[PDB]
Amino acid sequence: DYEIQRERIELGRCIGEGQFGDVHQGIYMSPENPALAVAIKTCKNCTSDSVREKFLQEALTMRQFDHPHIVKLIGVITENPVWIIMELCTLGELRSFLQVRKYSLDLASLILYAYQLSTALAYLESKRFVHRDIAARNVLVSSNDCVKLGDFGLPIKWMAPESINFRRFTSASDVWMFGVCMWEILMHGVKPFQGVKNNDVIGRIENGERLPMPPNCPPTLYSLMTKCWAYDPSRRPRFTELKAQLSTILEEEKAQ
Numbered sequence: 001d002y003e004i005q006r007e008r009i010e011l012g013r014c015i016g017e018g019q020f021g022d023v024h025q026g027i028y029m030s031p032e033n034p035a036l037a038v039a040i041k042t043c044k045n046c047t048s049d050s051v052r053e054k055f056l057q058e059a060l061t062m063r064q065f066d067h068p069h070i071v072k073l074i075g076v077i078t079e080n081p082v083w084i085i086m087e088l089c090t091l092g093e094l095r096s097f098l099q100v101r102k103y104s105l106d107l108a109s110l111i112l113y114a115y116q117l118s119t120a121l122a123y124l125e126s127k128r129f130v131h132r133d134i135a136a137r138n139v140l141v142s143s144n145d146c147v148k149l150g151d152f153g154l155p156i157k158w159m160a161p162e163s164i165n166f167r168r169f170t171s172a173s174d175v176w177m178f179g180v181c182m183w184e185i186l187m188h189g190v191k192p193f194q195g196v197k198n199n200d201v202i203g204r205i206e207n208g209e210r211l212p213m214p215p216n217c218p219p220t221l222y223s224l225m226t227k228c229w230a231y232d233p234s235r236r237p238r239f240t241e242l243k244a245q246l247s248t249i250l251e252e253e254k255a256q
């Protein structure tokens with residue numbers, strides 16, 4: 001089962017702050033693997049069952065997916081203090097990694113990350129799961145050549161127009177938000193619309209404006225991004241198709 005005995009967990013260095021509390025790395029001592037490196041999400045306010053409810057929904061949902069580019073649940077400890085134990089991605093959240101690895105990562109690698117992300121989102125799409133919070137900050141880096149979707153759950157600057165005007169969230173909103181994430185990656189983790197009032201962002205989308213083509217970004221990728229940003233959700237592509245196009249973009253980039 002998925003409940004874990006606190007005695008098999010050795011808490012270690014704090015590796016990040018989450019919505020609910022500190023995120024730690026640590027060791028999980030099971031009989032199947034005597035020393036498994038894990039991540040531990042903690043829940044600062046989980047004495048409140050309303051918080052505990054929302055915190056542990058993340059683990060109930062993780063548990064349903066099996067993809068190579070989606071983080072995996074190990075187990076939970078539900079007595080206080082409540083903990084989620086999940087796979088460790090030792091290079092942390094994608095945004096910081098992009099920031100710190102600027103000048104160090106090449107183009108093929110940035111494309112590799114977007115294509116990897118699209119395969120995770122095509123998989124979720126095939127399961128009819130809407131994610132609603134696709135952003136570089138919600139992706140983790142397992143290795144120089146492997147990123148993973150780390151969260152499932154306001155980010156106006158990332159959201160589709162119909163999310164903002166009708167609070168509506170669909171596979172097509174996800175596609176839109178994934179265009180923004182691709183932009184974020186080709187900009188090495190610069191946030192979209194920096195220094196722009198949220199409320200002014202919506203008018204500019206309605207005005208037809210869009211995020212600029214990043215430097216060093218290929219026309220083929222920018223064209224992909226702009227299809228993701230069709231104002232009408234029914235003109236935007238499906239991740240299955242985005243996945244296939246990014247596969248071609250990557251094979252050709254590898255060729256230089």
Ligand SMILES: O=C(O)c1ccc(-c2cn[nH]c2)nc1
Binds near residue numbers: 023039088089
């Ligand atoms: O700061 C965070 O929210 C954060 C940081 C790290 C991780 C992680 C999970 N597995 N490996 C790393 N999750 C969330």
